[model samples]
Target: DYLYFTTLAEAQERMYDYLAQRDNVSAKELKNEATQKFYRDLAAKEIENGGYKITTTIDQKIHSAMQSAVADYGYLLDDGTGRVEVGNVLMDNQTGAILGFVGGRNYQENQNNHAFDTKRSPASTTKPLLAYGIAIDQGLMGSETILSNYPTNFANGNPIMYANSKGTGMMTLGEALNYSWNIPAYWTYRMLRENGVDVKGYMEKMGYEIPEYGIESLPMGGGIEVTVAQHTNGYQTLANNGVYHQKHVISKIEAADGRVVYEYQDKPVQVYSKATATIMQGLLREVLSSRVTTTFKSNLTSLNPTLANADWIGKTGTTGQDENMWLMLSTPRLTLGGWIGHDDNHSLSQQAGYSNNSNYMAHLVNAIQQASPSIWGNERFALDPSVVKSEVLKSTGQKPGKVSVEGKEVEVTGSTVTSYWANKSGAPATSYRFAIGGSDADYQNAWSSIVGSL
Candidate 1:
């Protein structure tokens, strides 16, 4: 007999009725087998459908490492304030596995003054979350995409300018991200709205609770308040292969009888493709490279030399008044966020130290790197390293063509290039092709020939 039921109880009753006809059949055994087979088939189908199945659990070793790191960094505190302030922190990247976290206030003085709870402006930090993350995910623009940075008004018809009203022009996604230019970010936001992705809806999807005053400066890193922990975790979702997982401090709870009291399962929601995350990572790496100049200077060239060397990518956020400094860095295994600012939301008068400089953020991330090197060093946390490497495209979002230089056309394959030009003085054929091989002798020979001709 065919059986159809809407509820589990109804289905069970039908199954029992069918088994009653087969006098010797055991209904319990049949039900168990059928349910098991159904789940097994469903799992198989999900795997066959190109969806990922992730298994996650809390590791004691990683937890201990995190605790130790936080303690060393003065993130933990114990005082008589009665209000416990914990550092909102999370560490995860590419892999859905959360490596470490610490809760509570600073270690030195636990005065529940909400020092850790202070709402610091996110500044340029929101650019990636709103602009880059959403733009690339929707295919509106790729890493190499270019857009004009013309002056315009805010959505409410308020005037908004690029480079803080200092300049006007066009820039590529690559350049904008590398330099944290405000104009491209604004343009990307407008494009998102034009493509039917409403600003409010987009922010909500990313777990941001949009304020009633709304985002005043969506492009210039104004009107948004994000804690260091939330900012880090949000970025971690992107770093975690575009699947946002609930931030967790504990993975599972077990009873003394060896029964699982609670088991944490990684319910990953794909926000972006693995490809998009990779492309963003590549651009961020360039931003962190020593070749790139930032608004902040440091004795250390990159974000964190120790961490930057280990396939790390990051960005620095600064404001006009230098009121806040934020840094976010990530690797295939872990993502770190850091910030330094004043208690009264005032800009630091002095530019020295980590307060007014991006280097402070870099230093904090470096501290974490020094504590944890291998993903599996403390425990058997195996991570697959076979993920595809994304190709770095030109900032124009198009294949770069050859450029004519001194009567010779050279292809611009990468983002930036350095070339030399030579010319003979007071001659019809004054300009000549300049070529130099290895060594100082080659340069000297080329110079002598050019000078002799002159």
Candidate 2:
């Protein structure tokens, strides 16, 4: 009797609040509320009934490759800082579909979707998409244009340094991007802003939401946060010949009865001209093929010899003290965005041989290709007819006729370098000189007299 009485009291207490909400309702209102609640409860049972099926853009082979590659290559243990996390997102340039996604090292330990949901500093990988690409499209700079890699300061009296902390004098735009130097990229962004190029608007056109527009460190991919999925779309835009497609993973949703409930529609935006993108492709291609750096080419072709001769373009990036490692690579068919970092935002430099993210990137990409040989499908990067290759004087960044330093012509062999130029935008009109100092006055002259002339 006591047990039954206690159960009845508990039930009454549970219903008291709900009953209070119905005090002022009439019978018709009560009936309507009851009917609505019945349907809501019924709707909750749809999952158990298998009322809908989701059709994803994910390729089974590629998805499984990503999962297995992460398990094999990703470093998960703590190295005096914390457990390192790795992620990758593969996007189809033809359809903007996310073919494969690796959210994190282990989904069971960490539920965070690092590839899609987490935001981190993009580092130098952003230089190609933001600074160099915009400069090329705006007719401000080209592959042969000269850039200064000297010590410099921002407008706010802050000093800027390169990754090696040493100035390498004047270098062509291609060389600057090929080496991924911070000084030249910042100068490119500054030049664009001064020439009335819409920096923020161009970034938005390529699918980025700007937070702080005037940050000096933005060109180097600092002081801002972005996800791996967004970074992949930026490269996919380049691979698609300057066309930007909104990235999507869900193809459609269907009811249990085979009725279509929802489908995705693709929207394409022209972020850059075909000529500019084609020229950018050539410049990025040189990154791996150039004799200066074998880091990217070696890692990419280590497991798959077929990729050794394939048309590929990519860039690598790292944050301060190797806190974050990033590599964004693209084939003619798809783009792969990869990242390696710690969850606690600690430095990975202490861990020897583990900070280079390019190795991890290759492992994932190679695994995907091995799983499905025909996924890449032997597609070549398309070049526009207006984009032409020409040999220019490497030292002066002018038409190859004579090597002249300070108006003294010197005949030198192997001084001409091949560079891509867009007919619509034209090439560097005049031979230029790069400023060479860390003084505030030198920075002012570079800002006012040197880049301003461009």
Candidate 3:
């Protein structure tokens, strides 16, 4: 008797699920007074005739702040057209309940929903899910492992450059992720393929809905296809430390007589190991670091330093052609995935101040931190010590070539050594070390270049 129908539009949206789940509502149509009267009428009929109830996972307070902030980003970037704009899907990682979602603008134009768009590519956002998971598990590399900084052409063409075809320094598995180094990610996947691991075959075997985008070649984020829903499902598992909760809109449904018509089905499924997920979180948290350049949208704390104290981790991805821009922000409880680009495959930058998605998400994160505690309560991913053994020091601290007098190379070592979390039972390998050289100035410079790559 106390339930309130905030708006006809929301009451209408609830009708879409009329025959399926009566107890559902659209926070959008309700909170924003958004349109589509046809659905409202249909929803109203279902409620009246069947005595069905529909409620959405979206929180009203979060919705108001989300819509307003969403508007600010479209305006600030000057992208409001249904064709070229931003896209987002926010969810409760625990229940996989969607809190707020905006697929793109102008649902009134043609009902083009970007969030549901299956045609778009996922870009580099693919890393946190598979690259390191497979890489570390396959015994190819650990978080402390150092990879060659320079790009090599395994594609039989130009060496695959770091994102944007740009280059960065040599880095550890941990640092590579923080910086989004292309070489390391590329090699991770490449190493897999070379070892008889099939991309399409493996993904299919895992029971993934499977993104249609390119999944072959260096494990770099390229040509991977995914809808927002499919990707979020994967990320929510990572946020849950390898537990997958089938995302749903309706939690429960009851008839007028109080008989429970339906209840949430689907149990939490485990995809990645808790240890593996923990390592992924460690790498992802660095994305929010002050100087993360791994993605096109660099601003994290810079967008809102206030979030510095908030618990969050994320990653970004954008195709070189700019057909798709992606940023995945996740807290211990909430996971938000965003996309910005045009339907015509135009670059986001050409439109107007596009590609500041980190800032775009930061606005939402800042607001959530300040105003919505229950929705985004101070959350932190629990560290899984069994999987992540980061380097003892920030830098490898290994010096350039120094050799023995008998044409032998001197072995440089560190004071403290740790076992690769991936191999706790194995011997403790030197986390950071260097090799000496015996050569001319040119040879020395070449060796120096390799060492300095760090």
Candidate 4:
């Protein structure tokens, strides 16, 4: 991708020509002869003194944790033959700063990078990023909105499945997300089309990397190629209250003389309404609470269990073809996304002959948190009250009593005294309650970007 320039003039011409087209400017509008000469002298001066020093947000604690996690749980190893690859990306959820980035298991051993070099289907993770986001934003879906878990065929006669060919009757949209069943997601797409709502434009607006052909399977995370950088950014946006802050690896660039040539600018664009973000966040939280994965159920129970203390939101994804597995963890503090699979897109098994990288990724996060606690342990997602809509319990299966909401007591039945509901940040009521009514769509679009009935 580099163009050779034997002379300064050629280099300048190439740079100007490239930028002119890229910036949509006429070549004549570029720097005049005087400006060019000045820049040339400055460049020469900089080169004579020293080269530019690029600074990044690769934090010490974060880097150590990422490295430690890989050592502890990464399934793939450098076996001389380069077949398996691991990609992990971490970022400051609030700022989108690249805290830790591991492109592959080891860059020196293999030049191929899973972070950005390899593009794979997002799988179920697509629900959180686009489908659910779009739906909640457009008032198309809610956390407790009912949808069918029943498996059925698409027009092509391809059967959309619930895990292991089981699942019957209706369930909430929140339940669908908890289990990551594909049938509801498939139906969601069909319903969207029936409603005359197209997500292509909205997805493009959100900077999703999905292409036109990918629209056919957008809900299920198919027909598209997604990179870790983009994937992490998508989830980061959800953590940032529906605002997508474009991520950058570089923090700043300084000239040899210590003058800053460039400083990163934080540009956050609104991708969805605050309601949608909360709705998805709550559903994502369900992944941790539900034992469906057995890992979260048996290993790490609840979104904010006694051990973690941190109110974590998590999601897992795998390709329909079983070529990839992904685990994403996000909180108000940071976001981590990892992909487990081979460069060849081979079918993976948990058996000794094969490895399930997704589990490794989850274990990596666990290892990181165990190795370095405070960076993760004490931190919890601080969702705004209006956005989270907390409710107190009046009674439970084991315990029974009214608990205060803000100040006054509210009735609820659960082991916990309160529950977090998805609501706007500034609701007029003191007590939280689920919204009364809306036309529910069950043959639901999985991940969303449109604003209409479906």
Q: Rate the local accuracy (lDDT) of all candidates.
A: 0.49, 0.69, 0.58, 0.58
Per-residue lDDT, model 3, residue 312, is: 76
Arranged by TM-score with the best first, the candidates are 2, 3, 4, 1
| TM-score of model number 3 | 0.73
User: What lDDT would candidate 3 get against the real structure?
Assistant: 0.58
Q: Which consecutive 10 residues in model 3 have the weakest lDDT in total?
A: 430-439
> Lowest lDDT 10-mer window, candidate 2?
1-10
TM-score of every candidate relative to the true structure: 0.59, 0.79, 0.73, 0.71
Model 4, 63-139: lDDT tens digits are: 67676666555544333333557788877777887777666665556657676567888788887765666655655
Better of 2 and 4 by lDDT: 2
**Model 1 pairs in collision:** 85-104, 85-105, 86-103, 86-104, 87-104, 94-239, 144-395, 144-397
Range of the 10 consecutive residues with the lowest summed lDDT in candidate 4: 445-454
Error of 2 at 73 (Å): 1.8
What candidate 3 gets wrong by more than 4 Å, as runs, is: 1-51, 79-83, 154-158, 163-169, 196-207, 211-215, 253-262, 294-305, 350-355, 388-410, 414-420, 426-454
Candidate 1 residue-wise lDDT at 69: 48
Error of 1 at 42 (Å): 40
Writing each residue's lDDT as its tens digit, candidate 1 over 130-150 gives 887676666555554555544
lDDT of 3 at 207: 40
